Write a protein that binds this ligand. Structure first.
Ligand SMILES: NC(=O)c1ccc[n+]([C@@H]2O[C@H](COP(=O)([O-])OP(=O)(O)OC[C@H]3O[C@@H](n4cnc5c(N)ncnc54)[C@H](OP(=O)(O)O)[C@@H]3O)[C@@H](O)[C@H]2O)c1
Ligand SMILES: NC(=O)c1ccc[n+]([C@@H]2O[C@H](COP(=O)([O-])OP(=O)(O)OC[C@H]3O[C@@H](n4cnc5c(N)ncnc54)[C@H](OP(=O)(O)O)[C@@H]3O)[C@@H](O)[C@H]2O)c1
Lengths: 258, 258
């Protein structure tokens, strides 16, 4: 059929390109969009149309910025009658609000579970909501979707919970290795760990260490979000310490000096 | 030659038994020791001798209790001229002080990296200090020693750092899964984690979770020690929150209840 995209950045380009290569007609509205967006669209060769025509597609995918997710849902919510797929990196609470704005359509919470830069359209996408199985039918056109949870908010929650764990582990590794570094024992500690944490441990370990530091500010903000989502369900103990570690984080051994 | 043991409890029995079966004469002093200790000694068949005769052995191993380690070193240090191997669970700084008490001998910081109970004499032991290589010669007699670090305190630090990391991950896992459970998403989070943490994750995680809950009381006490040990080297942030989780912890899904 036709799949319309709200926004046409990196995610929309990768996804649209794949769908197009499998015979799907992809459409987007370029009115008011930047030259970079207009160029990605023209590189892919998507159908240029009006906003309301985009909203008429049986599947509409919102791939804008986290800060624009609610506004896109509000503008689309007045017209979309098919399925509206929000694939933005937003919190479960924001997803539920976006869902309330889609008044006549079926809302699907999609969460990208990997790097679009490294995996392309083969990236694993999880989706939740009553209409998720309908979105998953796009797997016939080259996508890699899987249905998880039961309602909008669940897919984004799984992604947030996984990310929460991985950020906490990164913070723990940093504190552990800074102490090891003061004694000159970081390598020995890393080697004792590969004994019980796995074979490919040390590799991704150093990798996560470096990125946790480069993006300390961003990771800190992500942690405030996880603290809020967890509080709705439990009384969160770990985020507070993790945040303190990221607060501090503002040749891998060089990330350990202080 | 002759290996002397100060203290003759579970650790000493296990190691002495292995050494004896490989032809080493093992000796210890039973004066002032309890019935259970005298019994372990006679079950193994150790040579009963004077306190000073023990100190004369080329290798003297101190396997007493943490609260007795410094006193044992003070007494042995007036006599030992061979190698004094401290295998007690004391902080790295306590090990360094025990080292200063062996005034005429070489000191080796040995650290047991597993369960004596489950692995027996096959347990991996890491050892640090100038004379660590000399202690490692006992591998010829059935032990499993490996040299790490460079000076007394390094082996104990490495052990405590590994412990700090593995206990922190258990707490992070528990909190993440308990929140996931309240949303009915625990399996999804677990599958997403193995879909990213490579290794059999889901399995290595469910077991770590179970053990952490079963032994929550001991884990809590163990974390207080880790916190104190980390404090000798840095101003630790993570143990505070980790301790709060173990404070709470006192079919996998059953454990996720806060
Ligand atoms: N890239 C990744 O690896 C990745 C991974 C996981 C999740 N995500 C998520 O998926 C979403 C899209 O990511 P992305 O990298 O493609 O972003 P870009 O930020 O790469 O592209 C989004 C593009 O959305 C447009 N936009 C902003 N406001 C808009 C509005 N009111 N109406 C229509 N379009 C609007 C922009 O057009 P203009 O340029 O003209 O403003 C923009 O091109 C994000 O929410 C992000 O968190 C991305
Ligand atoms: N068991 C393990 O899996 C394990 C693992 C890692 C580290 N460690 C450490 O290694 C050491 C020994 O462990 P363990 O399990 O064998 O303990 P026990 O507690 O099994 O044995 C210690 C034995 O030391 C003796 N002792 C107490 N005060 C003494 C003194 N002043 N002089 C001489 N002997 C004295 C006792 O004699 P009495 O019975 O007469 O009191 C005692 O048998 C400890 O520091 C412990 O923390 C043990």
């Amino acid at each position: 059929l036709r799949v319309g995209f709200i926004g046409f950045g990196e995610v929309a380009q990768t996804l649209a390109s794949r769908l197009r290569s499998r015979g799907v007609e992809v459409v987007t509205s370029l009115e008011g969009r930047s030259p970079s967006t207009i160029e990605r669209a023209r590189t892919v060769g998507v159908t240029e149309t009006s906003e309301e025509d985009v909203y008429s597609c049986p599947v509409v995918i919102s791939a804008v910025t986290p800060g624009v997710a609610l506004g896109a849902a509000r503008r689309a919510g007045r017209h979309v009658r098919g399925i509206y797929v929000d694939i933005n990196n937003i919190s479960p609470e924001t997803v539920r609000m976006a869902s309330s704005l889609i008044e006549k359509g079926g809302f699907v919470d999609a969460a990208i579970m990997g790097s679009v830069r490294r995996k392309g359209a083969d990236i694993r996408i999880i989706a939740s909501g009553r209409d998720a199985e309908e979105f998953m039918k796009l797997n016939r056109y080259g996508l890699n979707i899987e249905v998880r949870g039961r309602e909008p908010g669940d897919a984004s929650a799984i992604k947030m919970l996984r990310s929460s764990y991985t950020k906490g582990v990164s913070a723990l590794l940093w504190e552990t290795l800074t102490a090891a570094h003061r004694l000159g024992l970081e390598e020995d500690v890393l080697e004792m760990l590969e004994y019980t944490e796995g074979n490919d441990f040390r590799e991704s370990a150093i990798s996560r260490l470096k990125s946790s530091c480069i993006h300390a500010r961003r990771r800190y903000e992500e942690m405030k979000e996880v603290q809020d989502m967890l509080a709705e369900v439990i009384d969160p103990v770990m985020p507070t310490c993790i945040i303190r570690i990221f607060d501090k984080l503002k040749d891998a051994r060089l990330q350990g000096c202080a």
